[PDB]
Amino acid sequence: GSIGQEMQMGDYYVRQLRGSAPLINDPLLTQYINSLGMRLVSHANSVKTPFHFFLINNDEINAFAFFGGNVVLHSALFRYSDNESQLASVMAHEISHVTQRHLARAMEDQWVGALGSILLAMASPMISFTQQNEQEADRIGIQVLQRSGFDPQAMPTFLEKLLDQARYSSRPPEILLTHPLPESRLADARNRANQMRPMVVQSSEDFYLAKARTLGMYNSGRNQLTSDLLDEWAKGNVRQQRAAQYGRALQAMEANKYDEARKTLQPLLAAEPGNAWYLDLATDIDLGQNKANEAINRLKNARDLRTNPVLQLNLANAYLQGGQPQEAANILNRYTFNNKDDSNGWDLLAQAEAALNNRDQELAARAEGYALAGRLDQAISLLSSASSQVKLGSLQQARYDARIDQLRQLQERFK
Amino acid sequence: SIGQEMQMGDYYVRQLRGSAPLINDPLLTQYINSLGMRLVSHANSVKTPFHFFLINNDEINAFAFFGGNVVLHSALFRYSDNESQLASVMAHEISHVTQRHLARAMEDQTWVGALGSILLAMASPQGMISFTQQNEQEADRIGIQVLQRSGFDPQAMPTFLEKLLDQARYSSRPPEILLTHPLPESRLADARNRANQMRPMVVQSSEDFYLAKARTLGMYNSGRNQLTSDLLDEWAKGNVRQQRAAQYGRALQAMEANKYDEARKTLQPLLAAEPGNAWYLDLATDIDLGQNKANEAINRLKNARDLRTNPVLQLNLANAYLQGGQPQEAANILNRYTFNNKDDSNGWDLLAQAEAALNNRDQELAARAEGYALAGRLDQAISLLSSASSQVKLGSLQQARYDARIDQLRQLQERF
Amino acid sequence: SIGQEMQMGDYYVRQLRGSAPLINDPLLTQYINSLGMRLVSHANSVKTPFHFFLINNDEINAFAFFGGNVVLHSALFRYSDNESQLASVMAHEISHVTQRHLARAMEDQQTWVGALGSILLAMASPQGMISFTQQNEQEADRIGIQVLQRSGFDPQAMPTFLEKLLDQARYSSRPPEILLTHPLPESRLADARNRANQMRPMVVQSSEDFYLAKARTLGMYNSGRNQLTSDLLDEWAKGNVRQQRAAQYGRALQAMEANKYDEARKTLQPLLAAEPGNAWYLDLATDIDLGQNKANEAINRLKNARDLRTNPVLQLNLANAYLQGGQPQEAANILNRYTFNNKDDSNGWDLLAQAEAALNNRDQELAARAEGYALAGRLDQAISLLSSASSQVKLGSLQQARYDARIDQLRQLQERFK
Numbered sequence A: 001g002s003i004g005q006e007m008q009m010g011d012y013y014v015r016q017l018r019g020s021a022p023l024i025n026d027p028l029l030t031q032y033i034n035s036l037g038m039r040l041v042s043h044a045n046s047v048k049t050p051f052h053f054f055l056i057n058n059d060e061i062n063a064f065a066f067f068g069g070n071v072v073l074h075s076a077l078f079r080y081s082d083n084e085s086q087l088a089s090v091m092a093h094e095i096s097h098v099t100q101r102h103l104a105r106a107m108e109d110q111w112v113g114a115l116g117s118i119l120l121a122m123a124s125p126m127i128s129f130t131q132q133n134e135q136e137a138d139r140i141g142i143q144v145l146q147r148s149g150f151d152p153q154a155m156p157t158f159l160e161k162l163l164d165q166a167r168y169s170s171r172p173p174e175i176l177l178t179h180p181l182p183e184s185r186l187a188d189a190r191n192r193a194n195q196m197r198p199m200v201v202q203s204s205e206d207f208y209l210a211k212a213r214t215l216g217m218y219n220s221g222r223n224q225l226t227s228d229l230l231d232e233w234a235k236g237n238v239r240q241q242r243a244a245q246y247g248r249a250l251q252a253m254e255a256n257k258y259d260e261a262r263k264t265l266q267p268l269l270a271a272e273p274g275n276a277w278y279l280d281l282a283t284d285i286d287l288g289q290n291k292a293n294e295a296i297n298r299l300k301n302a303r304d305l306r307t308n309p310v311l312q313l314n315l316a317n318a319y320l321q322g323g324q325p326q327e328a329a330n331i332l333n334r335y336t337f338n339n340k341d342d343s344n345g346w347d348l349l350a351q352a353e354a355a356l357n358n359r360d361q362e363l364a365a366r367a368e369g370y371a372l373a374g375r376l377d378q379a380i381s382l383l384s385s386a387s388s389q390v391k392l393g394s395l396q397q398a399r400y401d402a403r404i405d406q407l408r409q410l411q412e413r414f415k
Numbered sequence B: 001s002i003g004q005e006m007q008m009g010d011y012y013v014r015q016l017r018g019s020a021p022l023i024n025d026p027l028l029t030q031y032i033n034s035l036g037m038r039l040v041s042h043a044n045s046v047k048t049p050f051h052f053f054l055i056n057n058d059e060i061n062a063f064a065f066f067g068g069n070v071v072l073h074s075a076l077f078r079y080s081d082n083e084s085q086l087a088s089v090m091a092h093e094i095s096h097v098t099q100r101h102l103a104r105a106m107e108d109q110t111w112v113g114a115l116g117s118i119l120l121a122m123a124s125p126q127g128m129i130s131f132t133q134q135n136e137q138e139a140d141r142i143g144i145q146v147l148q149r150s151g152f153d154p155q156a157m158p159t160f161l162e163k164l165l166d167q168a169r170y171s172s173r174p175p176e177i178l179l180t181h182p183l184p185e186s187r188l189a190d191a192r193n194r195a196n197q198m199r200p201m202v203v204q205s206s207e208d209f210y211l212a213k214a215r216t217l218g219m220y221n222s223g224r225n226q227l228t229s230d231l232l233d234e235w236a237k238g239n240v241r242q243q244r245a246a247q248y249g250r251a252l253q254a255m256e257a258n259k260y261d262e263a264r265k266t267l268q269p270l271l272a273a274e275p276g277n278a279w280y281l282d283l284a285t286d287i288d289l290g291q292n293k294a295n296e297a298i299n300r301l302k303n304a305r306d307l308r309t310n311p312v313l314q315l316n317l318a319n320a321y322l323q324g325g326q327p328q329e330a331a332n333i334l335n336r337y338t339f340n341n342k343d344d345s346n347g348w349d350l351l352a353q354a355e356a357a358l359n360n361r362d363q364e365l366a367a368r369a370e371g372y373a374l375a376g377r378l379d380q381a382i383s384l385l386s387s388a389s390s391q392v393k394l395g396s397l398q399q400a401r402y403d404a405r406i407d408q409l410r411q412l413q414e415r416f
Numbered sequence C: 001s002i003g004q005e006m007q008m009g010d011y012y013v014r015q016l017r018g019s020a021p022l023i024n025d026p027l028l029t030q031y032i033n034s035l036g037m038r039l040v041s042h043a044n045s046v047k048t049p050f051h052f053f054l055i056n057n058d059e060i061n062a063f064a065f066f067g068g069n070v071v072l073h074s075a076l077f078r079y080s081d082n083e084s085q086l087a088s089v090m091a092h093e094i095s096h097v098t099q100r101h102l103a104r105a106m107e108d109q110q111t112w113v114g115a116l117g118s119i120l121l122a123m124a125s126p127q128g129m130i131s132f133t134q135q136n137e138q139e140a141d142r143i144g145i146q147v148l149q150r151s152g153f154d155p156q157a158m159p160t161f162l163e164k165l166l167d168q169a170r171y172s173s174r175p176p177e178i179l180l181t182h183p184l185p186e187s188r189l190a191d192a193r194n195r196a197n198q199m200r201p202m203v204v205q206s207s208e209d210f211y212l213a214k215a216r217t218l219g220m221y222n223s224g225r226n227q228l229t230s231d232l233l234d235e236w237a238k239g240n241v242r243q244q245r246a247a248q249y250g251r252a253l254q255a256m257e258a259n260k261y262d263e264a265r266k267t268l269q270p271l272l273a274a275e276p277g278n279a280w281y282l283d284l285a286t287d288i289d290l291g292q293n294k295a296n297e298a299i300n301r302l303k304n305a306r307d308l309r310t311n312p313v314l315q316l317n318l319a320n321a322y323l324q325g326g327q328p329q330e331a332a333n334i335l336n337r338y339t340f341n342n343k344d345d346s347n348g349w350d351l352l353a354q355a356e357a358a359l360n361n362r363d364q365e366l367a368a369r370a371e372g373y374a375l376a377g378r379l380d381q382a383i384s385l386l387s388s389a390s391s392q393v394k395l396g397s398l399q400q401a402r403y404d405a406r407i408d409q410l411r412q413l414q415e416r417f418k
């Protein structure tokens, strides 16, 4: 209902985001961000909607949310987050904006294209909340933040770490424009945090690796994985130090020095052959120097290949670079149906259907990528081509034409 | 004006074709329009062309709208015991148009789409149009006069009306025909009086009627519209026309059940007696192509007397050429056909198949566009023609043709 | 010596089960033996029962050994354009055994029994390999084509297949492994054309079981070059009505593989509506229903089949449906009868183990698992399971004596061979 209307608007805005904002669609980073975000939602109160967490390639710090439990986070959050609980505090803040329906209340009381044009401007390299909205979001946030097993003091520590940067810097962090931070708010955040018991929690090994991949592979402007940080991480706790070798191998591979990335990756590969993170890096090193087969053999022998979308996409791509397009199609035809919103699967499906010379299937896989990006007229154009290369009355013609109808009914709902 | 309702009639027909289950069989649409135009031939104050559509729906109903477009549910064939009763339903609808009953109903009134959605719901098997008793009184009086001038039995209208009332007088929910067309006793009584007042005329239902009934009930099987062997057993004892149609009906079901050898020898006696009959020639091609004897189907149709004049024979021979591996000959016929019958989607689809086999892709896309345009999917048709226009040289004649047709389809969109 | 060879053949198939990737799918195994036995029924001097095995291997090969056991690599469905090509290869193998070529070849030499088994396992596994003389291959072709035509297949399908093998041994650098076991010099090819030309032309249409088998093999058991490609399905969509239905089946199968259950139901719907009693469509409709947690709908459809008491495919399908439906006792009643009537079918023993596991009858589950291990030649493991099963029942009980008795049989089977 109003849940239905708001999830319909949520999808429209997510499509607009995908079409203009620079989202990181990395399988590992998308998986981590959503697995961490769901962990907070499962401990939140009054959840009416599914939740999805999006990552922008933007070195300006910002976080916001809109209808349908869609939370969008700038990758610069990893630069500011010293630990996983800090990053979780910002997400818990955003989920609390959603559970309180702060944005819904404002627009209800007193335009769809006007609000959507602001959401794209905030993500691309404005909405503002009252001081009661921010007060509600911090408390409800910190309560769901520690029921999730994170450090409650991380929220005031991150806020005060935000306030200190705003005072000295030429221009304030853009997140402080969407979420204003008077000293009154920080003092209130310190009060409720101090009211609970101290909790020193170790950040997940997945957090340190995500921050390494976010800053090393998706570097941009101030979002660099500096040699200072890694020399610093080489001296740290048990989880931080192997995250060091991972990021070191990353840019050795980024700079096309693949032989250097092999020797750095060796010990973590040999020690942990069953986790997706170095398996993923252990596919890119192999395909970069035309060693596709053992990258396939390595992924064929993986345990959680039939459980983890990251290994499936990695192995599908390896089959493509290995000259076996059909094996890639077999995986991707099932992946696209179980991961309807993952534009990586649709793109790889199109690449495989292109290599098999199945033109209408290629055009159809391309169309789903264009529909996900809000380019409905363009997706309809591709399906019309697809429908024109199969015989009328066939199973494929009825499918392509029915899909055109769906996209046309989706289009009129807002136009 | 009249130009808009003819144009609005085309709009409703297009979205009817795109979603209602219309029967596109060459013989059936040729018969029902031939019978319908014969009635228009004797109607007064006709200001529009007329077209008659057949819908696969076992619920009996009939209605008409702007542009002289009459819609008939296939169930009318099982209710009509003779040809004059079926014509009685058409003359009723025809009079609804010449009196412009629905037109004035919509003059006293998102309004076009509101009625389009209603017409579409009435047509599909699964907010409905109803006419006033005055409109229905006029539609029977003028309708029975059109029906007498056309050389049928005027008494078929009240017998039909009494047939349906005798069956639906007691039902909680009568058939949909009586909701659109309310039949109190007063309207029946007046219908029977005016029929009694003119002259008696005993007419025999044309041969074409009995085989149209057999094919409608036979090939377009669905639900209560099966042709039970009960009707075929009865027709085997009826008049000379009903016994032939009975054996044509079971030759039809033998072919439906892939009993091709049974179907040939069952159709055997009828084809020998009337070797130039379209109904028998049509069925013989179905049997021949089902046994991969395309050559035999071609030679028979090439020797057909009125192949050069009858659209049913042209389509059958064009399709046989296709199954025979001669796409060029099929295209030679279909190019002539599609320009002689611009609204026939059977012609356009077969031409698309021929042009695909010939690998003339821009001509194939152009033919495919017409099928999509006739079904109300104008954007899709415009898309195909844009592809066709992109595969011809700039400044070429073909490019000017495709671009000009896109303009016609685009202009047809902006009217609604 | 027939008694020795048929027990020696049992040892080899046990060794095949335990190491080669055999396709145990009920429909496919039933088809390949239905057609194989149809050729044996028209063969001469048959002294042995016959079983045909399907290996999930994309390299084309076929071979046969003692006890009338013929092994067929699933690649054969990729090379076979018609049912008579497939039968031509099977008749060739059936001709190898009735002439006892492998038996007569090994009487010349005399440890050795296991050296032959390692060769057989290496040929079967995808990954020292037996090859026949030119005399043997001539006999197997001459005798085979006569069996092939007595069975109502196209005799010209034998020379047409042989040349198809040669035509891609020159196109590719790869020589098909079938031609390493069964050498194909041009003398043999000319001989095959000659014997076929002496017989009368026969246009036979393939059974619709062949196209569905080809569809199920390449679509459900796809591997390497064995794929049910869109190119194949498009050509079947343009062919005769049997290929059109099989193309509809194959696409429904692949939708089911990809969890597109509602799409798969709409695709199978016209085929199952046309023949509601067809095992291939009944089988697929069950997979679709169980995929959507619709066991009751799956159970009810299979109880309405005529051949439920006669067709082993429907029996296993319904036992598994009962399993997913939370009725394991009803599954066990089917499988207790099945495993008694089909002692050598590993599917029955595995599903019975699942049913006894679901009923918390641990010793009966262990004994069922043991049969699966014994059929795969893992006799010590099967003895280990039966020993543990015997340890959960009372001494002097009827169950104790049976578990111990079967241990005795398995150990007695161990000392006959090394």
Ligand SMILES: [Zn+2]
Residues within 6 Å of the ligand: A093, A097, A129, A133, A134, A137, A178, A179
């Ligand atoms: Zn906020």
Ligand SMILES: [Zn+2]
Residues within 6 Å of the ligand: B092, B096, B131, B135, B136, B139, B180, B181
């Ligand atoms: Zn009326």
Ligand SMILES: [Zn+2]
Residues within 6 Å of the ligand: C092, C096, C132, C136, C137, C140, C181, C182, C183
């Ligand atoms: Zn041989």
